[PDB]
Scaffold this active site. Structure first.
Site, PDB file in Angstrom:
ATOM      1  N   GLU A 291       0.842  -1.188   0.000  1.00  0.00           N
ATOM      2  CA  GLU A 291       0.000   0.000   0.000  1.00  0.00           C
ATOM      3  C   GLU A 291       0.882   1.244   0.000  1.00  0.00           C
ATOM      4  OE1 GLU A 291      -2.216  -1.342   3.371  1.00  0.00           O
ATOM      5  OE2 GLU A 291      -1.087  -0.112   4.787  1.00  0.00           O
TER       6      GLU A 291
ATOM      7  N   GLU B  18      22.477 -11.986  24.890  1.00  0.00           N
ATOM      8  CA  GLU B  18      22.024 -12.502  26.178  1.00  0.00           C
ATOM      9  C   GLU B  18      20.544 -12.838  26.153  1.00  0.00           C
ATOM     10  OE1 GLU B  18      23.800  -9.584  26.263  1.00  0.00           O
ATOM     11  OE2 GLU B  18      25.719 -10.233  27.117  1.00  0.00           O
TER      12      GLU B  18
HETATM   13  N1  LIG Z   1      -0.906  -1.294  18.017  1.00  0.00           N
HETATM   14  C1  LIG Z   1      -1.148  -0.933  16.763  1.00  0.00           C
HETATM   15  N2  LIG Z   1      -1.786  -1.805  15.908  1.00  0.00           N
HETATM   16  C2  LIG Z   1      -2.039  -1.446  14.630  1.00  0.00           C
HETATM   17  C3  LIG Z   1      -1.659  -0.201  14.164  1.00  0.00           C
HETATM   18  N3  LIG Z   1      -2.029  -0.115  12.870  1.00  0.00           N
HETATM   19  C4  LIG Z   1      -2.630  -1.272  12.512  1.00  0.00           C
HETATM   20  N4  LIG Z   1      -2.644  -2.106  13.595  1.00  0.00           N
HETATM   21  C5  LIG Z   1      -3.195  -3.470  13.664  1.00  0.00           C
HETATM   22  O1  LIG Z   1      -2.669  -4.295  12.641  1.00  0.00           O
HETATM   23  C6  LIG Z   1      -3.664  -5.217  12.245  1.00  0.00           C
HETATM   24  C7  LIG Z   1      -3.416  -5.766  10.844  1.00  0.00           C
HETATM   25  O2  LIG Z   1      -2.924  -4.782   9.964  1.00  0.00           O
HETATM   26  P1  LIG Z   1      -3.793  -4.340   8.685  1.00  0.00           P
HETATM   27  O3  LIG Z   1      -4.830  -3.313   9.064  1.00  0.00           O
HETATM   28  O4  LIG Z   1      -4.437  -5.546   8.049  1.00  0.00           O
HETATM   29  O5  LIG Z   1      -2.713  -3.719   7.672  1.00  0.00           O
HETATM   30  P2  LIG Z   1      -1.584  -4.666   7.033  1.00  0.00           P
HETATM   31  O6  LIG Z   1      -0.909  -5.473   8.114  1.00  0.00           O
HETATM   32  O7  LIG Z   1      -0.586  -3.816   6.290  1.00  0.00           O
HETATM   33  O8  LIG Z   1      -2.351  -5.642   6.009  1.00  0.00           O
HETATM   34  P3  LIG Z   1      -3.045  -5.103   4.661  1.00  0.00           P
HETATM   35  O9  LIG Z   1      -4.404  -4.512   4.965  1.00  0.00           O
HETATM   36  O10 LIG Z   1      -3.220  -6.269   3.723  1.00  0.00           O
HETATM   37  O11 LIG Z   1      -2.147  -4.084   4.005  1.00  0.00           O
HETATM   38  C8  LIG Z   1      -4.976  -4.471  12.380  1.00  0.00           C
HETATM   39  O12 LIG Z   1      -5.995  -5.349  12.788  1.00  0.00           O
HETATM   40  C9  LIG Z   1      -4.702  -3.451  13.464  1.00  0.00           C
HETATM   41  O13 LIG Z   1      -5.345  -3.838  14.654  1.00  0.00           O
HETATM   42  C10 LIG Z   1      -1.013   0.682  15.018  1.00  0.00           C
HETATM   43  O14 LIG Z   1      -0.669   1.792  14.624  1.00  0.00           O
HETATM   44  N5  LIG Z   1      -0.760   0.313  16.319  1.00  0.00           N
HETATM   45 MG   LIG Z   2      -1.765  -2.538   5.253  1.00  0.00          MG
END
Ligand SMILES: Nc1nc2c(ncn2[C@@H]2O[C@H](COP(=O)(O)OP(=O)(O)OP(=O)(O)O)[C@@H](O)[C@H]2O)c(=O)[nH]1
Ligand SMILES: [Mg+2]
Ligand SMILES: Nc1nc2c(ncn2[C@@H]2O[C@H](COP(=O)(O)OP(=O)(O)O)[C@@H](O)[C@H]2O)c(=O)[nH]1
Ligand SMILES: Nc1nc2c(ncn2[C@@H]2O[C@H](COP(=O)(O)OP(=O)(O)O)[C@@H](O)[C@H]2O)c(=O)[nH]1
EC number: 3.6.5.-
Lengths: 50, 35, 82, 436, 146, 49, 426, 64, 426
Positions: D70, D253
């Protein structure tokens, strides 16, 4: 709760037993030192008297 | 085995030389003499 | 080495168990003795206020002994005092 | 003594966006790439060697790459406030999304970008001289982070091999969720994560939400706070290399004291003291209470009860004014405490390290400045409980063959679904066996 | 007694946290030159000196020149209070150096000599932040900071 | 739910106290053995006297 | 004349050695610049034992830094009296042990041992009359235990006719700093019984409670902790470096202290120790020094000597004193508590005196004891080893470079042998 | 060779611990049985006086 | 040579000893920094009975403070001359006796007496010739009574042949500060009648009366009373520290005063005690001092001698006077008050003179009488005990801590037979 209170009371009972045993340890150590001192003194007295 | 059982009877003798009858007597006499 | 370790462990265990059992028995006998000496002293205590009459005759002017009539003399002395 | 960081997926890129601003605040680097002429806070020159490499005349660049198919998040970073900080070649942006599909992220678009990614990492490592390890940042609940992350991990492993791999992986919560294919993506990623990554650090979302609700007293938090505190934990972990202390460690470690078995590497994280600015000046902070705080179940970053499990090994980093005495005393107290139980595999399961650098707080942050801090990384079986919980919903959803047509259309088959199922089942078997 | 029964070590001494809060991230930097050409080998060398206003501690760092004959060592003297005076040491307990014994922020005058552990450094430059701090707090004129 | 959480915590506390009492048992045995050995030493010394 | 060559291995060893060289340089009267500023000529006449004059009286210590940590290099260089050591002697690797005895003894050792040996051979032939080796190192680390042990083996092979003092800190479960301590210990102690001539065993918890009650310190950092160790190390060479009425070198100490070839595990202590607030209230006299030294709470090991019997002991006194009172007090502390000695060795205690007390005091003493109580600590670490070995935990990291199980079981065998023979002679 | 004498030294060590441990257990048992005999003698003395003074009318020793 | 260890128990005893140490230090002419500044050289030949030289003129008392609260220690160190005590001797509890004899003798004793006994053992070993111990305490408070009795029992047990001077201040109904004063006093005397060798009985009522009538102070604080007690408790031992034409030490006084192994409760008094207004209007001669010495209002106890008879009485004169004049004065007193003296003992008065009087005065006297009138206080307290014990008032606080009912009955049996023994020989 009844089991917990029973186990806890067992615990402080065993603790006080251990503490009394340690006090006995110290008393026995002091007795050791004093008795050995008397041993040396009486050995010297025996040699002199002989 | 043999030594273990010997020690068992020795301990039984040395802890039941005096009767529970006499223990109860001692307690009752203590209470009666306090009053 | 295995035989040596087994022998030493057995000796340690037998020493430990004898020590524990003997300590328990000695505590029981010490508890027995604690009550006895309290009886002797408290008997000495009440004798202070006794009159020499009952000090000299605390009892009166062949089978074994039962546990119910076992305190008749002490009750006689108590009744005298009362 | 350098390490290299790679961020994959939305979550990874955002967490790295937090980590790097935290790092430049720690080392006094302005957001435009150079340290100022008058204000000099640098506690020791070359102290940034782990993360920033100076280029010629006063221009520091990170030892990190961000990659994702993306383009939205990558160009947001490009146009953000940290424009000049990064080297414009580390920012790899694709054209179209992975769209929650492990097969799509790992096979179709996977082959296209992995070669460029590994080629850039190769040049980065060649520029590096004392490379220590890899720090991967992703979430397996998505498509990109699962597929591309797994493929890149496998290729980096077959390329280098011996170097340690720390994977700070975000996992789905038992209740909190934002996608539907997350069980599929998570198990598919796990099948390869288990046998490639050296040490996988668990991270949840609902647990951190509850933490920031309870301590920071923010009722409606966002991802920004989550990423900020994750960045703080990472900084506390790498402070041993970054700074100087009286009793320090490095990346080895961790893999030496924390991995008793080759397939048991799943780490629970904790950090203290999480205290707001209002209560910071009223509450009493010292080693005994921070160590006690770092152990209650409501103070660990993943929703799982440590009471149900028994610890294998715990590693404790201390930052700031901390002496060996009070940490040893707190260790003795926590060992004699009964509410937590250790297993008999390891009678001596504490690895303590101390560093003189106090924690830093970003301007405008939700954490107040404190004299000291502690971070804990621990081993347990609550992780296996989490895996069983996730596998249950996986098998229940799979029994009806739901959503499998996307995978088979992308080109994969049910064979690896079966393989991942049996692998995860064997993993819970291994945890419950070792717990004896 | 309170240490015996359990008490925070930092709270034992006290009067620590105000100074850290007030100056968490304030450092005075000075450019020193050490002249030792009177000794057999080596020549006069520049170093930098950091004075942390958070703890009133001193840390001397060494700057390395390219193609020099010296092993690269980033740090020259550990971050600690500088004794500024000789004290009769004990083989059991290392000396505890108090503030009036150690240097103070007002001791550096840009043209005097500092007896750092016998070495006789001559500091000759300072950053603009340090100059501004000196003018604001110690009432120093512009000429002194030159 | 509240009953379950309290019950689980209470079982855990029972386990804590149980193994703590076991440790106390072992410490008491060690103290007993040390008392015995010192007593033997005392008797040797009074025999010499 | 007589030369002691000193090696610093591992983080703990290097940090202890830094304080040791600080103490000895202060005693011999040179400022940290490296120039002589002492007042009495007693400091100069025996300056060759530890220092070498290069040019301009710029004395250089005869010390050998050995590790894998440029960070520890920076720490040594930054600490006061840290620039005196030789940049040539700063022999250090680049990888990092990572807390693994196998890594420290086999993989990185295979490449860095050649450099450490040819450097140590360099100073060995630099000095005229080599007296012995002393190495300060830990036992639970990788670059302190394994690398130091391999260096010990090579040095024993090179020079079979030299005394060896190994200053090694041994772990305790109460104060535990890492996880693979039983493994590292078992390996190092398995090798040291054959290789090392004698070892001064130390631990952290004993020093902790010593600075708790004796020194009455509030925040006992490592800077306070290593100071007692450095004082003991400086004291053990008082006869070599200063005149006295009864000289005793390392070999003389060893002969009077080692009845059997494999009993060379000595526990050490120092006197006088007292808090700063009660210095003016406390007298200084030999009876008080003896009563302080012979107490268990003055010992630097977590081994209660009342749980065993001393095979032999020695005292190194310093200051203008009375030999007659020294001998009478040794006789008293051998006669009154006679049960805690061994009956088939008469005269369990060897005493010696030196004419110069350390600076800042007026009368000092160091106690060294070969007593059987250390078998408790060895039993403790052997149990730690067995519990982890009982299913081969944390063992793939060791086997991943060439380790096997035969040496692991031989180490346990030898530890069982040591503890068995101590209990045999009790 | 080294493990040959260790084998026989173990035999000598095994012989030594056999003698020391067996005699130690015997001595402590003899000590404590003498002590318990003294205590039971004291108890028997205590029983006699209570009967004879207060309410006995008879008293009777056991066998042993 | 001869040595008296000093121990202070409880708040009352601690403050009394704090004043006493100031008094004796001033008498020996030492600066409150522990250094010597006096003029008469005779002071320092016999300071070893009470003092130990530390380092170049620094002297430390041979005393041990013991209690269970920090306030007393803070007060004694805040007061002047509080910088001379050795900090290592400050055995010190944390929880407090709560004016509870069970706490002082069964709860906190079991955890603190092991600590307080080793330090006094060390202090006694520090000196060569032991003459005795000096315990200062009350008989109404918790730690003053229970801890004191337990400590004196242990000391008697471990030194079976040494003297014990116990300065015990006893409660009086007219001056009562707590409610369980009989409950404490009876139990404490129950042990003092066997363990102690001589108990100086004191009470605050007589001290108040002395300060009101002959001293004529308006508002006397505890400081004046402690200073008034210090005079006698220092003049009792002047025979050890200073020469005299007829010397008499502690054992000599004991063997003369005590006719039977149980009657060792003595009343004390000092002379002169004159108001500064009338100091110039009275003569100081031994006949004049005899009247104030034998005045019933001068006794330090609220026990009228005229309601009984004297068994023995000792006169410790200080200064240079005439032995014949002293002897004839005592003879005249004995002849005139013939009925007040027992019949079957000729010459019921022992006398002795020491050449060095307390500074400022050139003449002083101390009276120690073992009269049979002292049973009045024991009746006084026993009646209160029975009044409270008939209803078992306040008895749970003691029964629920480790003693049982019959201990109080035993204590009353002993008290009643002691007063019976006095009445018997009357
Ligand atoms: N803690 C935290 N979790 C996040 C953040 N952004 C996304 N996530 C989590 O990451 C999970 C999976 O990521 P996606 O939203 O699917 O984005 P991606 O991993 O790049 O996968 P794609 O949509 O295919 O691009 C989501 O369910 C969110 O809960 C963040 O900024 N902080
Ligand atoms: Mg993504
Ligand atoms: N006394 C003391 N012990 C130290 C010091 N630094 C480390 N240690 C000890 O060294 C042990 C671990 O050794 P380690 O750091 O692994 O040695 P390494 O091989 O150089 O890494 C720990 O138990 C510490 O207690 C120090 O400055 N003083
Ligand atoms: N002479 C004198 N007597 C005191 C002083 N303080 C308290 N007392 C007496 O001591 C009694 C109380 O004993 P206390 O010291 O409280 O006993 P403790 O609490 O066990 O130490 C009271 O009846 C007071 O008369 C003092 O400063 N001087």
């Amino acid at each position: 709760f009844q089991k917990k209170r029973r186990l806890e009371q067992q615990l402080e009972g065993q603790g006080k037993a251990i503490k009394g045993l340690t006090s006995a340890m110290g008393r026995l150590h002091v007795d050791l030192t004093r008795v050995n001192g008397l041993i040396a003194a009486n050995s010297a007295a025996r040699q002199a008297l002989a | 085995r043999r030594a273990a059982e010997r020690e068992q009877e020795f301990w039984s003798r040395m802890t039941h030389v005096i009767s529970d009858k006499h223990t109860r007597v001692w307690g009752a006499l203590e209470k009666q003499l306090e009053k | 080495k295995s035989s040596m370790d087994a022998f030493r462990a057995g000796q340690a265990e037998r020493l430990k168990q004898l020590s524990l059992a003997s300590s328990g028995a000695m505590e029981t006998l010490r508890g027995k003795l604690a009550v006895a000496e309290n009886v002797l002293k408290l008997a000495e205590l009440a004798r202070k206020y006794e009159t020499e009459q009952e000090k000299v005759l605390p009892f009166w002017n062949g089978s074994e002994v039962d546990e119910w009539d076992y305190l008749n003399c002490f009750f006689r002395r108590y009744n005298k005092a009362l | 003594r350098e390490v290299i960081s790679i961020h994959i997926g939305q979550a990874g890129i955002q967490v790295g966006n937090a980590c790097w601003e935290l790092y430049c605040l720690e080392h006094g680097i302005q957001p435009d790439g150079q340290m100022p002429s008058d204000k000099t806070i640098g506690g020791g020159d070359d102290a940034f060697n782990t993360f920033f490499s100076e280029t010629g005349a006063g221009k520091h660049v990170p030892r990190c790459i961000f990659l994702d198919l993306e383009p939205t998040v990558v160009d947001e970073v490009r146009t953000g406030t940290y424009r000049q900080l990064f080297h414009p070649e580390q920012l790899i942006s694709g054209k179209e999304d992975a769209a929650n599909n492990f097969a799509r992220g790992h096979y179709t678009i996977g082959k296209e970008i992995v070669d460029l990614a590994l080629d850039r990492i190769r040049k980065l490592a060649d520029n590096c001289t004392g490379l220590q390890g890899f720090l991967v940042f992703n979430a397996v609940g998505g498509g990109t982070g699962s597929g591309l992350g797994s493929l890149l991990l496998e290729r980096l492993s077959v390329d280098y091999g011996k170097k340690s791999k720390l994977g700070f992986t975000v996992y789905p919560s038992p209740q909190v969720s934002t996608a539907v294919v997350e069980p599929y993506n998570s198990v598919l990623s796990t099948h390869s994560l288990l046998e490639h990554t050296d040490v996988a650090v668990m991270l949840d979302n609902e647990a951190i939400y509850d933490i920031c609700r309870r301590s920071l007293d923010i009722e409606r938090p966002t991802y920004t706070n989550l990423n900020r505190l994750i960045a703080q934990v990472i900084s506390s972990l790498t402070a041993s290399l970054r700074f100087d202390g009286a009793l320090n460690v490095d990346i080895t470690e961790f893999q030496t004291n924390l991995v008793p078995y080759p397939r048991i590497h799943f780490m629970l994280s904790s950090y203290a003291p999480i205290i707001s600015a209002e209560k910071a000046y009223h509450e009493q902070l010292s080693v005994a209470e921070i160590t006690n705080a770092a152990f209650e179940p409501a103070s660990m970053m993943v929703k799982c009860d440590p009471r149900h499990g028994k610890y294998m090994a715990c590693c404790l980093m201390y930052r700031g004014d901390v002496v060996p005495k009070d940490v040893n005393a707190s260790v003795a107290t926590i060992k004699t405490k009964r509410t937590i139980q250790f297993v008999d595999w390891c009678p001596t399961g504490f690895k303590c390290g101390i560093n003189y650098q106090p924690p830093t707080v970003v301007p405008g942050g939700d954490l107040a400045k404190v004299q000291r801090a502690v971070c804990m990384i621990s081993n347990s079986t609550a992780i296996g409980e989490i895996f069983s919980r996730l596998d249950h919903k996986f098998d229940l959803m799979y029994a009806k063959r739901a959503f499998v047509h996307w995978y088979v259309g992308e080109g994969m088959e049910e064979g690896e679904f079966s393989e991942a199922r049996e692998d995860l089942a064997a993993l819970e078997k291994d945890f419950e066996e070792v717990g004896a | 007694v309170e240490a015996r029964l359990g008490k925070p070590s930092h709270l034992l001494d006290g009067d620590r946290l105000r100074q850290f809060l007030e100056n968490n991230k304030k450092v005075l930097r000075f450019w020193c030159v050490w002249d030792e050409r009177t000794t057999m080998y080596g020549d006069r060398r520049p170093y930098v000196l950091h004075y942390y206003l958070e703890d009133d501690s001193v840390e001397v760092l060494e700057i390395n020149e390219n193609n020099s004959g010296r092993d690269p060592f980033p740090v020259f003297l550990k971050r600690g209070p500088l004794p500024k005076v000789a004290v009769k040491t004990n083989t059991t307990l290392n000396p505890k150096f108090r503030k009036d014994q150690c240097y103070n922020a007002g001791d550096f005058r840009l043209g005097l000599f500092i007896n750092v552990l016998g070495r006789d450094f001559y500091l000759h430059d300072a950053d603009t932040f340090t100059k501004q701090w000196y003018k604001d707090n110690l009432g120093y004129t512009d000429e002194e900071m030159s | 739910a509240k009953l379950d959480e309290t019950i689980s915590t209470l079982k855990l506390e029972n386990d804590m106290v149980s193994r703590q009492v076991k440790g106390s048992v072992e410490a008491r045995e060690k103290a007993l053995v040390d008392h015995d050995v010192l007593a033997l030493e005392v008797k040797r010394l009074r025999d010499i006297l | 004349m007589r030369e002691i060559v000193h090696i610093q291995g591992g983080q703990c060893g290097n940090q202890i050695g830094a304080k040791f060289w600080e103490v000895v340089s202060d005693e011999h009267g040179i400022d940290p610049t490296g120039t002589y500023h002492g007042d009495s000529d007693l400091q100069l006449e025996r300056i060759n034992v530890y220092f070498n004059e290069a040019t301009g009286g710029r004395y250089v210590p005869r010390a050998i830094l050995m590790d894998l940590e440029p960070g520890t290099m920076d720490s040594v260089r930054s600490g006061p009296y840290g620039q005196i050591f030789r940049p040539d002697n700063f022999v250090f690797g680049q990888t990092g042990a990572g807390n693994n005895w196998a890594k420290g003894h086999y993989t990185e050792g295979a490449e860095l041992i050649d450099s450490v040996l040819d450097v140590v051979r360099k100073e060995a032939e630099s000095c005229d009359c080599l007296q012995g080796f002393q190495v300060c190192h830990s036992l639970g680390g990788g670059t302190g235990s394994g690398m130091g042990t391999l260096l010990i083996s090579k040095i024993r092979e090179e020079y079979p006719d030299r005394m060896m003092l190994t200053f090694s800190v041994v772990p305790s479960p109460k104060v535990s700093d890492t996880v693979v301590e039983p493994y590292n210990a078992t390996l190092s102690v398995h090798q040291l019984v054959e290789n090392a001539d004698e070892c001064m065993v130390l631990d952290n918890e004993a020093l902790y409670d010593i600075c708790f009650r004796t020194l009455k310190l509030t925040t006992p950092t490592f800077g306070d902790l290593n100071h007692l160790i450095s004082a003991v190390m400086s004291g053990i060479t008082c006869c070599l470096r200063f005149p006295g009425q009864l000289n005793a070198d390392l070999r003389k100490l060893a002969v009077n202290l080692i009845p059997f070839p494999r009993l060379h595990f000595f526990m050490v202590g120092f006197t006088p120790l007292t808090s700063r607030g009660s210095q003016q209230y406390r007298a200084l006299t030999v009876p008080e020094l003896t009563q302080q030294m012979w107490d268990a709470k003055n010992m630097m090991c977590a081994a209660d000597p009342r749980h065993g019997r001393y095979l032999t002991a020695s005292a190194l006194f310093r200051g203008r004193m009375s030999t007659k009172e020294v001998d009478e007090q040794m006789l008293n502390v051998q006669n009154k508590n006679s049960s805690y000695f061994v009956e088939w060795i008469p005269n369990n205690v060897k005493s010696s005196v030196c004419d110069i007390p350390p600076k800042g005091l007026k009368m000092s003493a160091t106690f060294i004891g070969n007593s059987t109580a250390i078998q408790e600590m060895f039993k403790r670490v052997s149990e730690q080893f067995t519990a982890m070995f009982r299913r081969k935990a944390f063992l793939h990291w060791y086997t991943g470079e060439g380790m096997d199980e035969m040496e692991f079981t031989e180490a346990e065998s030898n530890m069982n042998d040591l503890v068995s023979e101590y209990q045999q002679y009790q | 060779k080294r493990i040959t004498e260790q084998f026989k030294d173990l035999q000598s060590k095994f012989r030594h611990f056999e003698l020391v441990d067996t005699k130690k257990y015997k001595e402590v048992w003899g000590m404590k049985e003498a002590d318990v005999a003294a205590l039971v003698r004291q108890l028997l003395q205590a029983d006699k006086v209570l009967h004879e003074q207060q309410l006995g009318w008879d008293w009777r020793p056991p066998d042993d």
